[PDB]
Design an enzyme around this catalytic site. Structure first.
Site, mmCIF file in Angstrom:
data_model
loop_
_atom_site.group_PDB
_atom_site.id
_atom_site.type_symbol
_atom_site.label_atom_id
_atom_site.label_comp_id
_atom_site.label_asym_id
_atom_site.label_seq_id
_atom_site.Cartn_x
_atom_site.Cartn_y
_atom_site.Cartn_z
ATOM 1 N N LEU A 1 1.042 -1.080 0.724
ATOM 2 C CA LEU A 1 0.082 -0.286 0.012
ATOM 3 C C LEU A 1 0.742 1.284 -0.016
ATOM 4 O O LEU A 1 1.776 0.976 0.412
ATOM 5 C CB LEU A 1 -0.598 0.203 1.170
ATOM 6 C CG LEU A 1 -2.209 -0.944 1.255
ATOM 7 C CD1 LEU A 1 -2.893 -0.573 -0.051
ATOM 8 C CD2 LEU A 1 -1.783 -2.445 1.467
ATOM 9 N N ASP A 2 0.298 2.120 -1.015
ATOM 10 C CA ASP A 2 1.291 3.394 -1.104
ATOM 11 C C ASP A 2 0.938 4.046 0.116
ATOM 12 O O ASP A 2 -0.171 3.966 0.958
ATOM 13 C CB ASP A 2 0.763 4.348 -2.538
ATOM 14 C CG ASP A 2 1.283 5.094 -2.641
ATOM 15 O OD1 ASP A 2 2.711 5.502 -2.198
ATOM 16 O OD2 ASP A 2 1.690 5.265 -3.850
ATOM 17 N N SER A 3 1.603 5.191 0.378
ATOM 18 C CA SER A 3 1.004 6.516 1.186
ATOM 19 C C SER A 3 -0.459 6.740 0.805
ATOM 20 O O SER A 3 -0.837 7.962 2.142
ATOM 21 C CB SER A 3 2.092 7.667 1.300
ATOM 22 O OG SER A 3 3.469 7.145 0.170
ATOM 23 N N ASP B 1 -2.920 5.666 -0.063
ATOM 24 C CA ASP B 1 -3.293 4.647 0.936
ATOM 25 C C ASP B 1 -3.969 4.966 2.334
ATOM 26 O O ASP B 1 -4.184 4.355 3.050
ATOM 27 C CB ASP B 1 -4.075 3.253 0.286
ATOM 28 C CG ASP B 1 -4.388 2.997 -1.198
ATOM 29 O OD1 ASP B 1 -5.496 3.667 -0.998
ATOM 30 O OD2 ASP B 1 -3.608 2.571 -1.178
ATOM 31 N N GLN B 2 -2.304 4.634 2.100
ATOM 32 C CA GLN B 2 -1.639 5.515 4.355
ATOM 33 C C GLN B 2 -2.001 6.802 4.856
ATOM 34 O O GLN B 2 -3.274 6.369 5.458
ATOM 35 C CB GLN B 2 -0.522 5.811 4.093
ATOM 36 C CG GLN B 2 -0.235 6.376 5.181
ATOM 37 C CD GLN B 2 -0.040 4.276 7.213
ATOM 38 O OE1 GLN B 2 0.701 4.393 6.194
ATOM 39 N NE2 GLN B 2 -0.367 5.255 8.688
#
Ligand SMILES: NC(=O)C1=CN([C@@H]2O[C@H](COP(=O)(O)OP(=O)(O)OC[C@H]3O[C@@H](n4cnc5c(N)ncnc54)[C@H](OP(=O)(O)O)[C@@H]3O)[C@@H](O)[C@H]2O)C=CC1
Ligand code: SF4
Ligand code: SF4
Ligand code: SF4
Lengths: 80, 114, 156, 208, 176, 311
Positions: free
Chosen positions: A38-40, A42-43
């Site tokens: 998960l990318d930033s 989605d963070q």
């Protein structure tokens, strides 16, 4: 009912409630950034999704430095 | 060549600003799709929002990232106001195809073009 | 042939009635609007023909698109045009509106107002005269003489 | 000589000469060029770090009142290291005078937003933001004026073409106005209108 | 030199103050306004009666974009493209070929009546006065196709009248 | 082939396509959306109208500058149809009225019309004639409507054998006929068990324009069915739930009610949507599109309030 298990169960069912989680695979050192793919982007989706569910103001640096669901549990434990 | 800055001194505040704008555009989409009386599911809207953020993935200059943040915040000003219309927000969608291909072969039969 | 005869008389009645009043509204973007105001000048009356100003979009019959239709205007133009009853008519008044005209090769300018609404009557001239615009309205009234709607409905 | 040729003045010429040397003497930090054309309108050419000092000096100081403002259009010029030209045009009320303040800039470096010293500058500054894209730091309100909302691209640049990329039409497929890539029905035949044979001999730059 | 306005004051004489009071009561100069309007009422109106009594014009008026020809002669245009070179919205499409003799001509001479703006610059630029503004202004077209004039439309439009255009130019050639 | 039939450039707004269309009908629904996709595709559209010119003004601004053209015709002459197909690349037969007048029955429309136009079209040397029809056309009884369309399919496969007969099931769209018939139930409802499978109109006309631009289309009749295949009572529940109008279940011919209570069966004897290669869209989001009329400011804005299963 604001013990560790209440916070952990509530974070658990709302990350259940999240749809694009890949795979389910929740852990106390799950690290959904670099173990779940998960990318930033989605963070910050997940962090303000917690904020949408019951959250506080959750300032963007303290929102930005969480990265892991058990640390989110301890973060709400520190703040609530 | 010390250019005067916009907001920051390095890219970390730029990352902070763009993630704050993404937070704002996340919470502002269902308000608009409830308000302009459109015909689109919310999750489709949020996913095209994050697609429009991922369109600019290669940007590295700090002034330029600041200027994109200023553009996005100006359009979120225009969507917290109702100063825009139904046409503009559907124009962000690409729904009337335009089904234009990417293969070499279909671009060869419909050609004069690479 | 008494059925088609009576239907023909009644169709002639209602078509005369439609071409009688014909009050437009005032959209009026640029200097073609000044020519509309001089079509409201006393030397060329429209109220010889029952043709009255009416600023609401809810009771005009024809609508005069007169000016340089831009992109910031055009959706508002059609969202006026649609909420207007079923006999609706369009007078494209002026070189800007009838095909783009002098601002044709530019951004933010709709190249001819067939890209938004249909058009009954083009009246070229930049601006039209009051006389030429009045000629266009008379030809539109002759189109309303050429309807045969209710004859079509009966012979269907 | 006497007919058909506009007789140049000398009084205003010498006065604006002396006045330009006066301003150059009294603000040595922010003077690069002072120049006077043959028809005697003053130009002062400026590094964009003393824009607010020069404007606060020129509206005041009582040797030159300069109340009134006219626009600052940053005329789009390539080939320079800093591209754009912010052009103030100051028009006084007690003196019948015209000075121009050309400060320079480029595509990303902001200038210091002259709205705080001239209230007239606000919509002119929003115009130059929407049409060119020179961002103005320390400014209250930056919207987009005289364009479409969903449009971008800053069309007065030389890079933006004559007809736009986008084009609006209606369709009944979604019962609304949509946008499409541009399709012109006629080419817009450009004309080569640049004569040879050295149209003006006085204006030859020194060749390489 | 200047003449400024509303340097005035309410005069404090008794006849002055009672006349201002009577104007406050009866709205007297309001009735004077009614009288002025009735004075334009009994005035005879000045309209025309359109299909029968047309309005006036000028000899230098700008109309049709028609074409002339010589006395029993060729098409006067020689395809020199000055009309396109002054045409501001480029509504003059000219494609030229010489004909089957050696003399030079056209093929396609299209005027976009939409994109035209009726300057008169193609009147001022045409070296032989081959394109002329007409007198009449009645186009009024139910389609968009039928405001794009081809060459034979223009020449049949210019053969609908010449004595008209000859009269206007003959009465107007010395001026321009 | 003659020149200026060859394609040119990026399609849309005066890019000369390889087709010159001749569309019968087109005043109503399906032909209007078909002309809409052709004008986006950028063709030259001959359309006849036998009616008042207001509907032809209605479909005027769809094509580009002068790309469409109009004429007049009838079901009683031969010169007008021949003048329609003097110069036609492709020709489609959409015609059919939902109710009989006092002059034109359901008999002789699907007998006099498609024989005549098919004969003069085959004698005119056209390519790619496409005739539409309905699903579940039976030779047997219980529908004058569907048996006349069955005889129409028989005639159009009879003469000009390499035609294309296309049947969809019932179609729902932005100005649908049958859901706008479900409008009129609100002032008064009939409920029986019958399966049904609607299909949205724009992917129907996408399949039509792909099949009209692509050969292999001739001979093989095609069937256009959406992915739904569900029950009538669930459709009635669904439409009154999207409309938020309260209900208690129990311009109209009885042929209408026979159509909506006949059946909807399948045929694997012939290909369909994705076998031609066009996307099929489900019901629900287009239903949110088309039910905006009936709500009146109580629950006017809602999206995901209700989901109804298929089977
Ligand atoms: N599921 C399916 O397969 C179904 C398909 N359809 C088809 O969908 C299409 C659109 O439906 P719909 O809007 O109802 O139909 P249409 O709008 O196509 O109606 C037929 C057209 O032909 C004209 N017409 C009808 N009867 C005659 C006649 N006797 N003489 C001359 N002209 C005539 C009408 O003219 P005007 O209106 O101008 O008076 C109309 O424009 C039609 O082609 C229809 O057959 C319909 C139902 C079910
Ligand atoms: S057509 Fe001419 S008169 Fe009319 S709005 Fe355009 S410039 Fe003005
Ligand atoms: S200016 Fe006159 S002669 Fe020259 S090309 Fe044009 S119409 Fe012909
Ligand atoms: S009058 Fe019309 S055709 Fe003639 S130069 Fe002007 S725009 Fe062109």
């Amino acid at each position: 009912p604001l013990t560790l298990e209440g916070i952990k169960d509530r974070v658990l069912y709302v990350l259940k409630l999240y749809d694009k989680i890949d795979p389910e695979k929740l852990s106390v050192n799950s690290h959904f950034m670099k173990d779940l793919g998960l990318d930033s982007l989605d963070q910050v989706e997940i962090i303000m999704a917690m904020e949408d569910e019951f959250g506080f103001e959750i300032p963007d640096i303290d929102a930005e430095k969480l990265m892991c669901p058990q640390e989110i549990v301890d973060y709400i434990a520190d703040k609530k | 060549t010390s250019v005067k800055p916009i907001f920051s001194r390095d890219m970390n505040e730029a990352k902070r600003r763009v993630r704050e704008l993404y937070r704002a555009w996340y919470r502002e989409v269902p308000n608009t799709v409830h308000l302009f009386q459109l015909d689109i599911s919310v999750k489709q809207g949020r996913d095209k929002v994050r697609e429009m953020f991922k369109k600019n993935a290669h940007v590295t200059d700090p002034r330029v990232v600041d200027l994109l943040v200023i553009k996005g915040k100006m359009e979120l000003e225009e969507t917290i106001n109702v100063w825009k219309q139904r046409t503009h927000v559907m124009r962000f969608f690409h729904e009337t195809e335009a089904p234009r291909p990417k293969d070499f072969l279909s671009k060869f039969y419909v050609g004069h073009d690479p | 042939s008494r059925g088609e005869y009576v239907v023909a008389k009644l169709d002639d009645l209602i078509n005369w009635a439609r071409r009688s009043s014909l009050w437009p509204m005032t959209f009026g973007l640029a200097c073609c609007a000044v020519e509309m105001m001089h079509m409201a000048a006393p030397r060329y009356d429209m109220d010889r023909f029952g043709v009255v100003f009416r600023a609401s979009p809810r009771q005009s019959d024809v609508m005069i698109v007169a000016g340089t239709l831009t992109n910031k205007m055009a959706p508002a133009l059609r969202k006026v045009y649609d909420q207007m009853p079923e006999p609706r008519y369009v007078v494209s008044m002026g070189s800007c509106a009838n095909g783009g005209g002098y601002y044709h090769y530019s951004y933010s300018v709709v190249r001819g107002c067939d890209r938004i609404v249909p058009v009954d009557i083009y009246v070229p001239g930049c601006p039209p005269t009051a006389e030429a615009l009045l000629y266009g309205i008379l030809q539109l009234q002759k189109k309303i003489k050429r309807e045969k709607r209710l004859r079509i409905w009966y012979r269907r | 000589t006497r007919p058909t040729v506009r007789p140049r003045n000398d009084v205003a010429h010498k006065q604006l000469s002396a006045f330009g040397e006066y301003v150059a003497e009294i603000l040595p930090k922010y003077v690069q060029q002072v120049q006077v054309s043959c028809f005697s309108e003053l130009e002062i050419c400026i590094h964009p770090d003393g824009v607010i000092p020069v404007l606060t000096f020129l509206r005041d100081h009582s040797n030159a009142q300069f109340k009134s403002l006219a626009d600052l259009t940053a005329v789009d010029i390539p080939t320079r290291q800093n591209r754009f030209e912010i052009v103030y045009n100051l028009l006084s009320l007690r003196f019948n005078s015209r000075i121009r303040v050309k400060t320079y800039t480029d595509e990303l470096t902001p200038v210091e937003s002259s709205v705080s010293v001239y209230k007239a500058a606000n919509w002119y500054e929003r115009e130059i933001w929407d049409m060119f894209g020179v961002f103005f730091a320390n400014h209250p309100d930056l919207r987009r004026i005289l364009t479409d909302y969903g449009f971008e691209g800053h069309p007065f640049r030389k890079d933006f073409p004559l007809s736009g990329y986008v084009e609006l039409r209606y369709d009944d497929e979604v019962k609304r106005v949509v946008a499409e890539p541009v399709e012109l029905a006629q080419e817009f035949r450009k004309f080569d209108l640049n004569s040879p044979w050295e149209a003006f001999p006085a204006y030859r730059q020194p060749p390489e | 030199t200047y003449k400024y306005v509303n340097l005035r004051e309410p005069s404090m004489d008794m006849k002055s103050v009672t006349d201002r009071a009577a104007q406050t009561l009866l709205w007297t100069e309001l009735i004077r306004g009614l009288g002025m309007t009735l004075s334009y009422l009994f005035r005879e109106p000045a309209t025309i009666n359109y299909p029968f009594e047309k309005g006036p014009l000028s000899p230098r008026f700008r109309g049709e974009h028609a074409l002339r020809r010589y006395p029993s002669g060729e098409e006067r245009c020689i395809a020199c493209k000055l009309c396109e070179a002054v045409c501001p919205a480029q509504a003059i499409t000219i494609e030229a070929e010489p004909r089957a003799d050696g003399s030079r001509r056209t093929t396609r001479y299209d005027i976009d009546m939409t994109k035209c703006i009726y300057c008169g610059f193609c009147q001022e630029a045409c070296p032989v006065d081959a394109i002329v503004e007409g007198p009449n202004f009645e186009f009024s077209t139910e389609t968009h196709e039928e405001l794009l004039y081809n060459k034979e439309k223009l020449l049949n439009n210019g053969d609908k009248w010449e004595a008209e255009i000859a009269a206007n130019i003959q009465a107007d050639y010395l001026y321009r | 082939l003659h020149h200026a039939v060859i394609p040119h450039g990026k399609g849309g707004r005066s890019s000369v396509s390889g087709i010159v269309a001749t569309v019968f009908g087109a005043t109503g629904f399906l032909g209007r959306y078909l002309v809409n996709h052709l004008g986006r595709m950028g063709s030259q559209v001959i359309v006849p109208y036998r009616c008042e010119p207001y509907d032809t003004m209605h479909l005027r601004p769809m094509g580009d500058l002068g790309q469409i053209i109009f004429m007049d015709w009838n079901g009683r002459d031969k010169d007008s149809i021949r003048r329609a197909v003097e110069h036609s690349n492709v020709v489609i037969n959409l015609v059919g009225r939902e109710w009989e007048t006092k002059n034109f029955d359901f008999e002789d429309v699907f007998v006099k019309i498609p024989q005549a136009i098919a004969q003069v079209s085959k004698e005119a040397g056209v390519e790619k004639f496409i005739h539409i029809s309905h699903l579940n056309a039976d030779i047997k009884s219980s529908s004058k409507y569907l048996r006349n369309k069955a005889v129409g399919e028989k005639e159009v496969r009879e003469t000009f054998p390499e035609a294309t007969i296309i049947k969809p099931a019932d179609i729902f769209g932005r100005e649908d006929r049958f859901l706008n018939y479900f409008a009129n139930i609100r002032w008064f409802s009939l409920g029986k068990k019958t399966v049904k499978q609607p299909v949205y109109i724009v992917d129907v006309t996408k399949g039509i324009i792909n099949a009209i631009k692509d050969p292999d289309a001739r001979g093989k009749t095609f069937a256009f069915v959406g992915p739904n295949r569900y029950l009538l009572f669930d459709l009635v529940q669904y439409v009154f739930a999207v409309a938020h109008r309260p209900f208690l279940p129990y311009w109209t011919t009885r042929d209408k009610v026979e159509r909506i209570h006949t059946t909807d069966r399948t045929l694997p004897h012939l290909p369909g949507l994705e076998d031609l290669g066009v996307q099929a869209t489900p019901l629900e989001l287009k239903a949110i599109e088309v039910l905006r009329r009936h709500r009146t400011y109580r629950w006017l804005s809602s999206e995901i309030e209700d989901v109804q299963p298929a089977k």
